C-alpha cells in the first residue's frame, strides 16, 4: 500500500502538524482518540486511510508521524491536548535547552544528542510500511532546530534511504516581517540541505498568508492557527490523490516528473484558490474557471514574489470536488490565451492536471467556507529567485561586520561555512536566471 511518512521539526513544524493531523482525522472520520465509529456502525473494511495511518488490533489508528523538537514545550502541549491518545507516545524531545535560533547549535552540538532516536523511529515506521512513497518534512528556515536539525536529519536520510522522495514544506522568512534577528544566517546555511538533499521544496512566507487572510477571509487579526490550517489544506490537496479515487490521479512520483525540469530546479510555489469566508461564499459561482484564474493572481501567491516578473516553467493543477475535465481544458486554454502569463519556450505543454472526487473538508471552528470545488496550484517559476535575492542582501548586511558570528563559531561551526553557503545561494540564483533565457 502507498504510504507517506510525515516528519515535523521545530515549533512551526509541530504546529503545522497539529493542523494537518486535525484535518486528516476530520477527513477520514477518525476520532481524536484514534477510534473509527464508521467501522463499528456499518462494518468498514472498504476505506482508504493507510497513506497516513496504521491500523492496530483493537481498531485504534496510529498516525505515521515523527514529532521532533529540541525543547519540550510544544510536544508537551501535544501530549496533554485533545489528541493526546492519537499519536504514539514516541514524540521525541530533547530533555535540554533549545537551539537558541542558530544553525550550529541544532546541527552540531545538541542536534547530535537525539538524531539516533529520530532515525530509529523513522526506521521502525519505514519497516512497517509496504509501499512507502516518500517523506513529508515540515520545518522553518529562519529558526534554530528547524534549520540545523533538519539539515542533519536530511543528510542522514539521504545516506540511508536515498531513492525515496523527500518533500519540504518550509516557512521561508518574509521580506519585511521577521520574528528574530538572525533569520538570514539560518536561512542561508540551510541552502545546501534544501538543494542537494531535498527533491521538491515548497516555500511559504507568513506575510503572504497574512495578506490572504486579511483580503480573502476578512480576518483582521489572524493567528498562526489560520496559517497552519491553510498549509494543511494545501498538503491535503497534494496528498488526496493517494487516498481517494479520482478521474485523473497524480501520485508524488508523477507530480515530481511533470514539475521538476532539472535536478537543481525544484523550488515551486503553492497556492490554494477558493480561500473565502462563509459570508462571501455566496454571491459567487466558484466555478472551475474562476478558481483557476484566481490561482494565477500575484496577490494570491503565498510567497511574497511577483510571477509577472518571471516566466512560468511548469504548472500542476490538482482539483478536488465536482469537476469535469472539459472545464479544466477550457480554463487552461483561457489561461494560455493571456499574455500577462509568460511560459518558457522549451515547455510547450506546460500544465499537468489531476482531478479528485473528494471535496475539501471543513474543520469545525475554522474560517474557510464549505465549497463544492477547489484547486491547488503548484507552479515552478523563475520569479521566486527575486525573493531569495532579498534574503541574500540581509545576509551581507550582517556578514560585512561579522555580527553574531561568534555565537555560531563558538558551537562547532567554522567561519568559512558561512561564505561557502552564500556562494551556493548565488549559484542557485544564477541557474534560475539561465533557465529563463529564450532558446537561441
Amino acid at each position: 500500500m502507498r504510504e507517506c511518512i510525515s516528519i515535523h521539526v521545530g515549533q512551526a513544524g509541530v504546529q503545522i502538524g497539529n493542523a494537518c493531523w486535525e484535518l486528516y482525522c476530520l477527513e477520514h472520520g477518525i476520532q481524536p482518540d484514534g477510534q473509527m465509529p464508521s467501522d463499528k456502525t456499518i462494518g468498514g473494511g472498504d476505506d482508504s486511510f493507510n497513506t497516513f495511518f496504521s491500523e492496530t488490533g483493537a481498531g485504534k489508528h496510529v498516525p505515521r508521524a515523527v514529532f521532533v523538537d529540541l525543547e519540550p514545550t510544544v510536544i508537551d502541549e501535544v501530549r496533554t491536548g485533545t489528541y493526546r491518545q492519537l499519536f504514539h507516545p514516541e514524540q521525541l524531545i530533547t530533555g535540554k535547552e533549545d537551539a537558541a535560533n542558530n544553525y550550529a547549535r541544532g546541527h552540531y552540538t545538541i542536534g547530535k544528542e537525539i538524531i539516533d532516536l529520530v532515525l530509529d523511529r523513522i526506521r521502525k515506521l519505514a519497516d512497517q510500511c509496504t509501499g512507502l512513497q516518500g517523506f513529508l518534512v515540515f520545518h522553518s528556515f529562519g529558526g534554530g532546530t528547524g534549520s540545523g536539525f533538519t539539515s542533519l536529519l536530511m543528510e542522514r536520510l539521504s545516506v540511508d534511504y536515498g531513492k525515496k522522495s523527500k518533500l519540504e514544506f518550509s516557512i521561508y522568512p518574509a521580506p519585511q516581517v521577521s520574528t528574530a534577528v538572525v533569520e538570514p544566517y539560518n536561512s542561508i546555511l540551510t541552502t545546501h540541505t534544501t538543494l542537494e538533499h531535498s527533491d521538491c521544496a515548497f516555500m511559504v512566507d507568513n506575510e503572504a498568508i497574512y495578506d490572504i487572510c486579511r483580503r480573502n477571509l476578512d480576518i483582521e487579526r489572524p493567528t498562526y492557527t489560520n496559517l497552519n490550517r491553510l498549509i494543511s489544506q494545501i498538503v491535503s490537496s497534494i496528498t488526496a490523490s493517494l487516498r481517494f479515487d479520482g478521474a485523473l490521479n497524480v501520485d508524488l512520483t508523477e507530480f515530481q516528473t511533470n514539475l521538476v525540469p532539472y535536478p537543481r530546479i525544484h523550488f515551486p510555489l503553492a497556492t490554494y484558490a477558493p480561500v473565502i469566508s462563509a459570508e462571501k461564499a455566496y454571491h459567487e459561482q466558484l466555478s472551475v474557471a474562476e478558481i483557476t484564474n484566481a490561482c494565477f493572481e500575484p496577490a494570491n501567491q503565498m510567497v511574497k514574489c511577483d510571477p509577472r516578473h518571471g516566466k512560468y516553467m511548469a504548472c500542476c493543477l490538482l482539483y478536488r470536488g465536482d469537476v469535469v475535465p472539459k472545464d479544466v481544458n477550457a480554463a487552461i486554454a483561457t489561461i494560455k490565451t493571456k499574455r500577462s502569463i509568460q511560459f518558457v519556450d522549451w515547455c510547450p505543454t506546460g500544465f499537468k492536471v489531476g482531478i479528485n472526487y473528494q471535496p475539501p473538508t471543513v474543520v469545525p471552528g475554522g474560517d474557510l467556507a464549505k465549497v463544492q470545488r477547489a484547486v491547488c496550484m503548484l507552479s515552478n517559476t523563475t520569479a521566486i529567485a527575486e525573493a531569495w535575492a532579498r534574503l541574500d542582501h540581509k545576509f551581507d548586511l550582517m556578514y560585512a561586520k561579522r555580527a553574531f558570528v561568534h555565537w555560531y563559531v563558538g558551537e562547532g561551526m567554522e567561519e568559512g561555512e558561512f561564505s561557502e553557503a552564500r556562494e551556493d545561494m548565488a549559484a542557485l540564483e544564477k541557474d534560475y536566471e539561465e533557465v529563463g533565457v529564450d532558446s537561441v
Partner: protein, 360 residues
C-alpha cells in the same frame, strides 16, 4: 599604499608516499587543488582535468546538474612554491622584522595552518634542515655580535600559551592561571604579570628553552592527529639596547619580537564524544575570529576608530604589536592534496580576511 601587515602563503610539497599513492589517479587520489599562477596570486580548484569536455557543456544552459564554479582566485602579498627552500622563505619573511626590531620597533610573525600542511616543518624544521626560527635567532645573534662595539645588548625570552582564555607559562609550569594577568603599562607595555624570564646566550640555549616549553604545551589526541595543539603558543624575544661608549646614562631602548603559533580552526563534527574537547575548540574558534577582527580592522582605514582588542586574551596581549609602528607578517601553510581540501579552503579565506583584495 604601504601597510605594516603582510600575508605570505607557502604551499607544501607532496610527500613521497602521498605522491606515489595519489599520482595513480592523475596518470583515493590527489587532484592538486592549489595551482600557483603568480608570486601574488594562486588558484584553488582549477578546471585542469583533461577529460572535462563532456560536462563542460552543462555550464552552458543545457543541463543544470552542475553550474557552481568552485574555482577560486586568491591574491596574497607573497606566495612560496612547493620547491621554494627554507632560505628563500626566510629572506623575504623575517629579515625586515629583525631590522625593525634592532631599529627599536616591535615585530610580529604569526604561523597558521591546519593539521598536516607542514606548519611544524615551516617554523621548526628538522635538525638537518632547520626552520625559520633558527635562521631568525641565528641572524639576531650574528648581528648583535657584529654590533657589540658602541652598543650593549641584552636578550630576554618568554614563552607562554593562551588556553580557554587563560594565560599559562610553559617555561615555568605549576603557576596558578589567576596569577598571570595582562597589565597594560602607562608607557604602552603589555607586561604580563609573574611571567618567567630567561637570558639565553646562543641559539642552542634558545632551542633548549623552546623544546622545554613545548614539552609543557597543552595537547590532546583528536581526529587523525595523534597530537593536536589546543592553545595559542606565544614566544617573545625582548631586545634591550643601550649605548656603550657614548651617552652612558639611564636612557635606553627596548623592543619585542613575537612568534605566535595559532591552533587551527576545528569543525566540532570531527569530534563526536565532544565534551571538554568541544569547549576548547569553541574558544579556539572564537579567538581566531577575534584575531581576524583585529587584522582586517588594522587594514581598513575606515574602521581604525576602534579595533576590538578586548575580545580575547591573545588580541589584548598584542595591543601594541600589530599597528602601523610594528611590522607584522602571517605565514599561512596549506597542502595541495585533496585529502585536506575543505580545510585548505577555509585556511585560504582566513588569509583572505587580512586584506580582501577583490581585484584578480
Amino acid at each position: 599604499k604601504q601597510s605594516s601587515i603582510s600575508v605570505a602563503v607557502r604551499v607544501r610539497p607532496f610527500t613521497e608516499a602521498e605522491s606515489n599513492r595519489l599520482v595513480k589517479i592523475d596518470n583515493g587520489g590527489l587532484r592538486k587543488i592549489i595551482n600557483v599562477v603568480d608570486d601574488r596570486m594562486l588558484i584553488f580548484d582549477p578546471p585542469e582535468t583533461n577529460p572535462l569536455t563532456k560536462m563542460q557543456r552543462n555550464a552552458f544552459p543545457n543541463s543544470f546538474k552542475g553550474s557552481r564554479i568552485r574555482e577560486h582566485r586568491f591574491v596574497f602579498d607573497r606566495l612560496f612554491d612547493e620547491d621554494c627552500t627554507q632560505d628563500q622563505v626566510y629572506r623575504n619573511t623575517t629579515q625586515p622584522l629583525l631590522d625593525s626590531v634592532l631599529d627599536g620597533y616591535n615585530a610580529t610573525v604569526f604561523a597558521y595552518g591546519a593539521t598536516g600542511c607542514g606548519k611544524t616543518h615551516t617554523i621548526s624544521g628538522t635538525p638537518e634542515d632547520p626552520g625559520v626560527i633558527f635562521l631568525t635567532m641565528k641572524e639576531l645573534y650574528n648581528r648583535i655580535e657584529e654590533l657589540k662595539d658602541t652598543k650593549i645588548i641584552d636578550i630576554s625570552l618568554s614563552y607562554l600559551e593562551i588556553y580557554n582564555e587563560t594565560i599559562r607559562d610553559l617555561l615555568n609550569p605549576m603557576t596558578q592561571c589567576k596569577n598571570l594577568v595582562i597589565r597594560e603599562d602607562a608607557n604602552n607595555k603589555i607586561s604580563v604579570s609573574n611571567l618567567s624570564r630567561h637570558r639565553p646566550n646562543s641559539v642552542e640555549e634558545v632551542m633548549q628553552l623552546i623544546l622545554e616549553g613545548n614539552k609543557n604545551r597543552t595537547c590532546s589526541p583528536t581526529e587523525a592527529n595523534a597530537t593536536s595543539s589546543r592553545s595559542h603558543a606565544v614566544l617573545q624575544i625582548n631586545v634591550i639596547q643601550k649605548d656603550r661608549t657614548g651617552d652612558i646614562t639611564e636612557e635606553h631602548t627596548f623592543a619585542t619580537l613575537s612568534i605566535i603559533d595559532l591552533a587551527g580552526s576545528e569543525r566540532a563534527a570531527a569530534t563526536k564524544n565532544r565534551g571538554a574537547r568541544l569547549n576548547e575548540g569553541a574558544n579556539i574558534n572564537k579567538s581566531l575570529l577575534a584575531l581576524g577582527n583585529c587584522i582586517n580592522a588594522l587594514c581598513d582605514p575606515r574602521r581604525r576608530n576602534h579595533v576590538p582588542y578586548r575580545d580575547s586574551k591573545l588580541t589584548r596581549l598584542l595591543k601594541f604589536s600589530l599597528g602601523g609602528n610594528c611590522k607584522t607578517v602571517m605565514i599561512v601553510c596549506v597542502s595541495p592534496s585533496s585529502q585536506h581540501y575543505d580545510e585548505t579552503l577555509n585556511t585560504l579565506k582566513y588569509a583572505d580576511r587580512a586584506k580582501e583584495i577583490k581585484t584578480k
